[PDB]
Amino acid sequence: ALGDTLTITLGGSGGTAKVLRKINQDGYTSEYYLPETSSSFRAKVRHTKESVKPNQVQYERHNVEFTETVYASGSTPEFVRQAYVVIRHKVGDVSATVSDLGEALSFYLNEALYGKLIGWES
């Protein structure tokens, strides 16, 4: 499922709306595309499961990424702008705890943190 068109709204709530479309899906993966004169939008959704090895917990991983590429103009060559998240947990673990952890991570990140994190403070 997940819908047919993926919406990216740069600028958070109330921003500019961009719409992609399904292109391809293989290996439990999915891709979205949108072409433009000066740039293009990529979106990929991936799933995976680690190799079973006998007496330890077995884990499943999820990944979603947004990528933005700008075509070279004049001297400036190609360059990309990408940002993604990864989730890892157990297979039979209750989903509510993982969803709450994800909500917490989303809520902590905001434009204030992005503005601050750029300074390499640590």
Partner 1 sequence: MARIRNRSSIASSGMSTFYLFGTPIVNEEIIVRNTEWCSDVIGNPGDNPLDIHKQEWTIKPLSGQIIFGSGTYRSLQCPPEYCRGASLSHLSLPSQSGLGTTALARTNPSRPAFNLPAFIGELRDLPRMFKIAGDTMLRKGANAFLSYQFGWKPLISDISKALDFSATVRTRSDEWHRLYSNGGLKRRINLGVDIEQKKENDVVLHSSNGFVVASHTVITVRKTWATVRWRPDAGSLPPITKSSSEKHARALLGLGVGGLIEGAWQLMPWSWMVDWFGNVGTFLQASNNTIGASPGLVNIMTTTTTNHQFSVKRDLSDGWIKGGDCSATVTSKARSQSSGPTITASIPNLSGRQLSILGALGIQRVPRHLLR
Does 8 participate in binding a second copy (rule CB under 8 A)? yes
- One-character DSSP codes across the chain: ---SS-EEEETSTTSEEEE-EE----TT-EEEEEE-SSEEEEEEEEEEEPPP-SSS--EEEEEEEEEEEE--BTTB--EEEEEEEEEEEESSS-HHHHHHHHHHHHHH--HHHHHHHTT---
Which C-beta is closer to partner 1: that of 22 or that of 89? 22
The entry of a second copy, Ca ion, partner 1, none near residue 51 (CB within 5 to 8 angstroms by kind) is: none
Q: How far is the CB of 86 from partner 1 (least distance, A)?
A: 22
Does 53 participate in binding a second copy (rule CB under 8 A)? no
Q: Which of 13, 55, 75, 122 forms a contact with partner 1 (CB under 8 A)? A: 75
Give contact residues for partner 1 (rule: CB under 8 A): 1, 4, 21-23, 33, 35, 40, 42, 69, 71-72, 74-75, 77-78, 111-112, 115-116, 119, 121
